[PDB]
Amino acid sequence: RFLKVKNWETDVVLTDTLHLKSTLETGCTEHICMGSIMLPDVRTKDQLFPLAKEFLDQYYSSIKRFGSKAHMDRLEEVNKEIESTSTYQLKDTELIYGAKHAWRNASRCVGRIQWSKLQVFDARDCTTAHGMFNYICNHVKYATNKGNLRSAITIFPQRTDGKHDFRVWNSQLIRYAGYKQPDGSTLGDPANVQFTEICIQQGWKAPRGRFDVLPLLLQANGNDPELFQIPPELVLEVPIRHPKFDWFKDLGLKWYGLPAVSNMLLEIGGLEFSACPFSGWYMGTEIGVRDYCDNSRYNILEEVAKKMDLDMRKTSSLWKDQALVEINIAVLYSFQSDKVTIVDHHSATESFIKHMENEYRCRGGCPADWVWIVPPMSGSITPVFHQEMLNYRLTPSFEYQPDPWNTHVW
Amino acid sequence: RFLKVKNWETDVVLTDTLHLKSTLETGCTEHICMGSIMLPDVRTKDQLFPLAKEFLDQYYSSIKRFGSKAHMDRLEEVNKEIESTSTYQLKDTELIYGAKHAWRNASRCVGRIQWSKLQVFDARDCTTAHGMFNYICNHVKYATNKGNLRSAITIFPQRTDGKHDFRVWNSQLIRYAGYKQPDGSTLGDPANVQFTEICIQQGWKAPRGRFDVLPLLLQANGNDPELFQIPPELVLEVPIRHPKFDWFKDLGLKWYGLPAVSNMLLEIGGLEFSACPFSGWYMGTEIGVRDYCDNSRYNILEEVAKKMDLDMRKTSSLWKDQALVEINIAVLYSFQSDKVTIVDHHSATESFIKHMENEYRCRGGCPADWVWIVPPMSGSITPVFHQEMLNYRLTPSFEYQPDPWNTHVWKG
Ligand code: HEM
Ligand code: HEM
Ligand SMILES: Cc1cc(N)nc(C[C@@H]2CNC[C@@H]2OCCNCC(F)(F)c2cccc(Cl)c2)c1
Ligand SMILES: Cc1cc(N)nc(C[C@@H]2CNC[C@@H]2OCCNCC(F)(F)c2cccc(Cl)c2)c1
Ligand SMILES: C[C@H](O)[C@H](O)[C@H]1CNc2nc(N)[nH]c(=O)c2N1
Ligand SMILES: C[C@H](O)[C@H](O)[C@H]1CNc2nc(N)[nH]c(=O)c2N1
Ligand SMILES: [Zn+2]
């Protein structure tokens, strides 16, 4: 019931008490662990008030006013609002606190040392897709900040009866198009082929290139989604070169500087924000290991290894491993030379261990999903590999939601 | 019931039914996942007979004799043995099937494609530490096979009252001593410092070098353990050199060829085999990533990166990653050049995925601990990184057991 986590490199043992406030289900049972599974009608008046109360209690606790008149008055006001309206509205202070805590609670996020420095853009007054587009360009410009990136979230209106959802159809605000070719191969990012098809069939004129920034497909008020191109000048991109290999730049590789997740659902005090795009800055391996080297992505290992003239005849020469490191050296070098914030996996995981220690010391724990927190390369030479982590679900939370094209009816 | 697992690289979806045979608990609940926690007297008659029966039913199904007279007779014979003597003895065939299935069921093992090829040495007639020493020598020689490694396991007598346990005190049959210096540094393997001090206290004469093979410390029949030195001609070692870098040999690195886990408990049909040393062959990353490059182990990253003249002033040059790959190239090269079996992490994971898919078709599942199956370098360029896995506990099994110096009743 009171749980210990041990770091096997340092022998430091921490005691987790925060997990007892967990609520949602993990997917695990006593008989089966689903730790490696990626994915393991709106709230009635009955379900919503426990959720609001739970949230407001933690809020008033945080501002050291638990059980105060102002605490009791707010519970009163919200209770009244729910019974009479079937939902309620967060105060600005509550929305800011809830958004920061959703990030603080994100068990899969290695960058949470930053959780309290988050710029919240309140877009609850938005009513159209054009409005959404404006809010998103401003988010993009603010976060990008000419390369000196700033964490931000933009929060559109909450779910009502669920027939009027706000949704950004894109999985991220900035992503490259994917096209299936007569050749049989794939040009661009293979992960975006389906979305790119939905874009073309809504009218987008695809440049039909390798690195075409996709248009936004925005849905306001449960309406059919609409297409907008982000002003090209707001999308900061980085050409990829290597500090030692001249030929590298000739591969013709670039990536964008702003990672911005746009398909998640923010839950605060039982209220659901179906469109809540947020952004920070990249850890280099995301681009260099996953984006460039996954077999189902840009898949460039073979090409790089060839230009390095490594022995590709046997897996045991570790040619994939050598080329992997070089590609990751190139990503980091290129972002650093163009002064676009990026963090390496050594530095990011070191920060997260320090963050974990703060969260144990100050909050009684830190939910963490080791499968996602340990970087996709050089696992055991980062300190997080040796750190036991307990994974549990706290609210406010970010939750994955299914692609809306499955859900939506035109 | 059915549980689905997806591979996110191939879109292959598999269906697990075998998890319905899982009995033991995981450490996880609906509210907490303990998937990255490393560790998440006798049995009574009434808890033993169900376990025996479950096991014998599985054994007789495997041989296509479920429900036979031979099957029913063995159940009755075991029943009678338990009620009379409070335990029972496995037949040789059952012991062999049991030992192979514990490996098959080992969810943290990437090498399981090989499970049915395992040489079982029945050491249940052993009575003394000297007898244990002889059995272990024969195991080392057989398994080593002059570099052509063969999987093997030696099984000493089972637990009785838990006061007469056979135990191998070494965590592996072959490992290097560690010595803490007064200045706080470590000579040799820092992981083995405490064990090394026990051996010394037991009267081992320590050479005090960087790669001193530890003596065996063997406990028979709950007696105080006894020290034995493995004959050096039985310990195959590989000097580590690099195919391109001629300075690599002068780091003075070597490693032993035979990885042989000696501290685990084997459970078959509710019987507990507290000494059951087993061995296979290394995956290169075990030595090159963990043994050499963990900060709490030989910790050679700095010295290697120094000699490679890497830019070491900022982590973002990825100097550690670069040095790491070259050390692992060296390990695989050296083992291969000396014709000592080893497998790289690409080939091992690819084989494991084929094994896992086969197991799903023929068995209805393959419990797998992703946290351990994914290699400690280059994780996402191996196919296991992208494979969803279900972790659950089947018996027969291997279990961790606490180190014996904590629990042992010294007789003097
Ligand atoms: C400041 C820089 C940040 C860094 C370096 C960072 C790092 C990361 C990384 C490496 C992942 C794994 C994602 C993947 O492999 O696809 C991740 C996941 C995640 N992070 Fe962060 N993060 C940052 C900012 C943020 C912010 C600002 C938020 C929320 C406001 C956030 C919330 C999340 C969530 C919800 C996930 C899981 C995403 C999913 O399930 O797809 N992070 N983080
Ligand atoms: C034949 C070649 C084999 C290879 C390449 C191999 C590979 C591995 C590796 C890399 C691990 C993780 C070990 C670690 O990180 O410390 C492991 C774990 C394990 N394997 Fe194997 N294995 C092999 C044979 C065997 C055999 C013969 C058995 C038993 C009969 C076995 C049973 C186990 C068990 C019980 C674990 C978990 C160990 C623990 O909890 O400390 N494996 N295997
Ligand atoms: C099935 C599925 C479930 C979940 N929960 N997430 C995904 C998304 C999958 C999981 N890894 C790849 C893909 O992520 C794309 C977004 N990556 C993070 C980032 F690049 F956007 C990023 C990076 C740093 C900081 C921030 Cl704010 C954002 C898929
Ligand atoms: C706390 C704790 C719990 C558990 N279950 N295991 C350990 C042992 C921990 C787990 N990783 C480090 C240490 O293993 C050292 C032995 N490595 C395996 C091998 F080298 F012996 C090996 C390799 C390949 C094949 C075989 Cl048969 C054997 C520690
Ligand atoms: C099946 C497995 O859970 C899946 O491949 C995970 C593993 N760890 C990950 N870790 C991160 N950060 N991002 C991912 O997309 C994944 N994918
Ligand atoms: C805390 C964490 O569970 C621990 O460091 C694990 C991670 N994965 C591992 N995987 C293997 N193969 N061997 C290990 O020792 C570990 N250690
Ligand atoms: Zn679990």
PDB file of C-alpha atoms in Angstrom, chain B residues 88-203:
ATOM      1  CA  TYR B  88       7.485 -36.376  -3.780  1.00  0.00           C
ATOM      2  CA  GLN B  89      10.223 -37.166  -6.310  1.00  0.00           C
ATOM      3  CA  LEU B  90      10.123 -36.285  -9.985  1.00  0.00           C
ATOM      4  CA  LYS B  91      10.850 -38.917 -12.582  1.00  0.00           C
ATOM      5  CA  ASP B  92      13.812 -38.078 -14.870  1.00  0.00           C
ATOM      6  CA  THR B  93      11.479 -37.382 -17.809  1.00  0.00           C
ATOM      7  CA  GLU B  94       9.410 -34.999 -15.658  1.00  0.00           C
ATOM      8  CA  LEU B  95      12.498 -33.207 -14.360  1.00  0.00           C
ATOM      9  CA  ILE B  96      13.744 -32.657 -17.930  1.00  0.00           C
ATOM     10  CA  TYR B  97      10.370 -31.425 -19.220  1.00  0.00           C
ATOM     11  CA  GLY B  98      10.119 -29.243 -16.114  1.00  0.00           C
ATOM     12  CA  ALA B  99      13.543 -27.586 -16.584  1.00  0.00           C
ATOM     13  CA  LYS B 100      12.873 -26.934 -20.296  1.00  0.00           C
ATOM     14  CA  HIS B 101       9.464 -25.411 -19.470  1.00  0.00           C
ATOM     15  CA  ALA B 102      10.819 -23.108 -16.767  1.00  0.00           C
ATOM     16  CA  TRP B 103      13.138 -21.668 -19.471  1.00  0.00           C
ATOM     17  CA  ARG B 104      10.254 -21.550 -21.972  1.00  0.00           C
ATOM     18  CA  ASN B 105       8.237 -19.636 -19.350  1.00  0.00           C
ATOM     19  CA  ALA B 106      11.025 -17.211 -18.398  1.00  0.00           C
ATOM     20  CA  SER B 107       9.406 -13.934 -19.528  1.00  0.00           C
ATOM     21  CA  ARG B 108      12.616 -11.849 -19.172  1.00  0.00           C
ATOM     22  CA  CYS B 109      14.687 -14.146 -21.508  1.00  0.00           C
ATOM     23  CA  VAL B 110      15.273 -13.092 -25.114  1.00  0.00           C
ATOM     24  CA  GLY B 111      17.098 -16.372 -25.928  1.00  0.00           C
ATOM     25  CA  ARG B 112      14.085 -18.628 -25.645  1.00  0.00           C
ATOM     26  CA  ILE B 113      13.996 -19.818 -29.269  1.00  0.00           C
ATOM     27  CA  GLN B 114      16.544 -22.359 -27.925  1.00  0.00           C
ATOM     28  CA  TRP B 115      14.410 -23.624 -24.967  1.00  0.00           C
ATOM     29  CA  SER B 116      13.887 -27.177 -26.169  1.00  0.00           C
ATOM     30  CA  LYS B 117      17.637 -27.645 -26.670  1.00  0.00           C
ATOM     31  CA  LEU B 118      18.881 -27.848 -23.076  1.00  0.00           C
ATOM     32  CA  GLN B 119      21.127 -30.454 -21.507  1.00  0.00           C
ATOM     33  CA  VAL B 120      19.759 -31.441 -18.127  1.00  0.00           C
ATOM     34  CA  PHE B 121      22.225 -32.822 -15.572  1.00  0.00           C
ATOM     35  CA  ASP B 122      20.342 -34.513 -12.753  1.00  0.00           C
ATOM     36  CA  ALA B 123      22.387 -33.943  -9.605  1.00  0.00           C
ATOM     37  CA  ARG B 124      19.695 -35.035  -7.147  1.00  0.00           C
ATOM     38  CA  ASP B 125      21.966 -37.808  -5.711  1.00  0.00           C
ATOM     39  CA  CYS B 126      24.453 -35.142  -4.584  1.00  0.00           C
ATOM     40  CA  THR B 127      25.055 -34.967  -0.817  1.00  0.00           C
ATOM     41  CA  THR B 128      28.127 -32.752  -0.113  1.00  0.00           C
ATOM     42  CA  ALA B 129      29.739 -29.484  -1.209  1.00  0.00           C
ATOM     43  CA  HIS B 130      32.543 -31.486  -2.725  1.00  0.00           C
ATOM     44  CA  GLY B 131      29.964 -33.412  -4.730  1.00  0.00           C
ATOM     45  CA  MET B 132      28.466 -30.069  -5.811  1.00  0.00           C
ATOM     46  CA  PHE B 133      31.919 -28.856  -6.894  1.00  0.00           C
ATOM     47  CA  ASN B 134      32.417 -31.912  -9.111  1.00  0.00           C
ATOM     48  CA  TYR B 135      28.965 -31.578 -10.736  1.00  0.00           C
ATOM     49  CA  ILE B 136      29.553 -27.875 -11.454  1.00  0.00           C
ATOM     50  CA  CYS B 137      33.015 -28.560 -12.978  1.00  0.00           C
ATOM     51  CA  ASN B 138      31.467 -31.125 -15.377  1.00  0.00           C
ATOM     52  CA  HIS B 139      28.730 -28.651 -16.221  1.00  0.00           C
ATOM     53  CA  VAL B 140      31.284 -25.917 -17.017  1.00  0.00           C
ATOM     54  CA  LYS B 141      33.343 -28.231 -19.208  1.00  0.00           C
ATOM     55  CA  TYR B 142      30.323 -29.654 -21.060  1.00  0.00           C
ATOM     56  CA  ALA B 143      28.706 -26.211 -21.577  1.00  0.00           C
ATOM     57  CA  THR B 144      31.922 -24.550 -22.686  1.00  0.00           C
ATOM     58  CA  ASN B 145      32.768 -27.257 -25.199  1.00  0.00           C
ATOM     59  CA  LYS B 146      35.996 -25.356 -26.259  1.00  0.00           C
ATOM     60  CA  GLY B 147      34.007 -22.264 -27.344  1.00  0.00           C
ATOM     61  CA  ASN B 148      31.173 -24.072 -29.073  1.00  0.00           C
ATOM     62  CA  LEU B 149      28.771 -23.303 -26.216  1.00  0.00           C
ATOM     63  CA  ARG B 150      25.889 -25.639 -25.331  1.00  0.00           C
ATOM     64  CA  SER B 151      22.997 -24.790 -23.028  1.00  0.00           C
ATOM     65  CA  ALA B 152      22.884 -26.793 -19.840  1.00  0.00           C
ATOM     66  CA  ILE B 153      21.395 -26.894 -16.347  1.00  0.00           C
ATOM     67  CA  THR B 154      22.436 -28.887 -13.249  1.00  0.00           C
ATOM     68  CA  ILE B 155      19.752 -29.655 -10.662  1.00  0.00           C
ATOM     69  CA  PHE B 156      20.729 -30.376  -7.068  1.00  0.00           C
ATOM     70  CA  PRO B 157      18.312 -31.931  -4.462  1.00  0.00           C
ATOM     71  CA  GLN B 158      15.046 -30.056  -3.810  1.00  0.00           C
ATOM     72  CA  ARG B 159      14.067 -28.172  -0.623  1.00  0.00           C
ATOM     73  CA  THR B 160      12.780 -30.364   2.202  1.00  0.00           C
ATOM     74  CA  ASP B 161      12.117 -28.461   5.466  1.00  0.00           C
ATOM     75  CA  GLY B 162      13.969 -25.365   4.232  1.00  0.00           C
ATOM     76  CA  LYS B 163      16.639 -26.107   6.834  1.00  0.00           C
ATOM     77  CA  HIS B 164      18.605 -28.421   4.527  1.00  0.00           C
ATOM     78  CA  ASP B 165      18.838 -26.243   1.369  1.00  0.00           C
ATOM     79  CA  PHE B 166      21.354 -26.819  -1.425  1.00  0.00           C
ATOM     80  CA  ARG B 167      22.611 -23.370  -2.516  1.00  0.00           C
ATOM     81  CA  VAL B 168      25.213 -21.958  -4.827  1.00  0.00           C
ATOM     82  CA  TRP B 169      26.285 -18.721  -3.116  1.00  0.00           C
ATOM     83  CA  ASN B 170      27.747 -17.257  -6.287  1.00  0.00           C
ATOM     84  CA  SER B 171      25.213 -15.374  -8.334  1.00  0.00           C
ATOM     85  CA  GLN B 172      26.926 -16.750 -11.509  1.00  0.00           C
ATOM     86  CA  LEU B 173      29.348 -19.723 -11.670  1.00  0.00           C
ATOM     87  CA  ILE B 174      32.004 -17.535 -13.332  1.00  0.00           C
ATOM     88  CA  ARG B 175      32.534 -13.866 -12.222  1.00  0.00           C
ATOM     89  CA  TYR B 176      35.379 -11.507 -11.304  1.00  0.00           C
ATOM     90  CA  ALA B 177      36.269 -10.369  -7.815  1.00  0.00           C
ATOM     91  CA  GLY B 178      35.728  -6.790  -6.678  1.00  0.00           C
ATOM     92  CA  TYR B 179      37.887  -5.105  -4.073  1.00  0.00           C
ATOM     93  CA  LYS B 180      37.031  -1.747  -2.460  1.00  0.00           C
ATOM     94  CA  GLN B 181      40.140   0.281  -1.798  1.00  0.00           C
ATOM     95  CA  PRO B 182      40.658   2.506   1.253  1.00  0.00           C
ATOM     96  CA  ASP B 183      40.559   5.592  -1.132  1.00  0.00           C
ATOM     97  CA  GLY B 184      37.024   4.562  -2.143  1.00  0.00           C
ATOM     98  CA  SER B 185      37.856   3.311  -5.668  1.00  0.00           C
ATOM     99  CA  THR B 186      37.218  -0.259  -6.772  1.00  0.00           C
ATOM    100  CA  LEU B 187      39.620  -2.771  -8.312  1.00  0.00           C
ATOM    101  CA  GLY B 188      37.859  -5.340 -10.538  1.00  0.00           C
ATOM    102  CA  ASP B 189      34.051  -5.729 -10.630  1.00  0.00           C
ATOM    103  CA  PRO B 190      32.223  -3.394  -8.230  1.00  0.00           C
ATOM    104  CA  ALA B 191      29.077  -5.597  -8.395  1.00  0.00           C
ATOM    105  CA  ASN B 192      30.941  -8.445  -6.655  1.00  0.00           C
ATOM    106  CA  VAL B 193      32.559  -6.547  -3.761  1.00  0.00           C
ATOM    107  CA  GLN B 194      30.372  -8.017  -0.975  1.00  0.00           C
ATOM    108  CA  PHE B 195      30.602 -11.559  -2.295  1.00  0.00           C
ATOM    109  CA  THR B 196      34.373 -11.179  -2.715  1.00  0.00           C
ATOM    110  CA  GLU B 197      34.617 -10.121   1.008  1.00  0.00           C
ATOM    111  CA  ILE B 198      32.621 -13.195   2.050  1.00  0.00           C
ATOM    112  CA  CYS B 199      35.021 -15.478   0.104  1.00  0.00           C
ATOM    113  CA  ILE B 200      38.037 -13.723   1.623  1.00  0.00           C
ATOM    114  CA  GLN B 201      36.538 -14.145   5.087  1.00  0.00           C
ATOM    115  CA  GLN B 202      35.992 -17.824   4.287  1.00  0.00           C
ATOM    116  CA  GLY B 203      39.769 -18.088   3.601  1.00  0.00           C
TER     117      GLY B 203
END
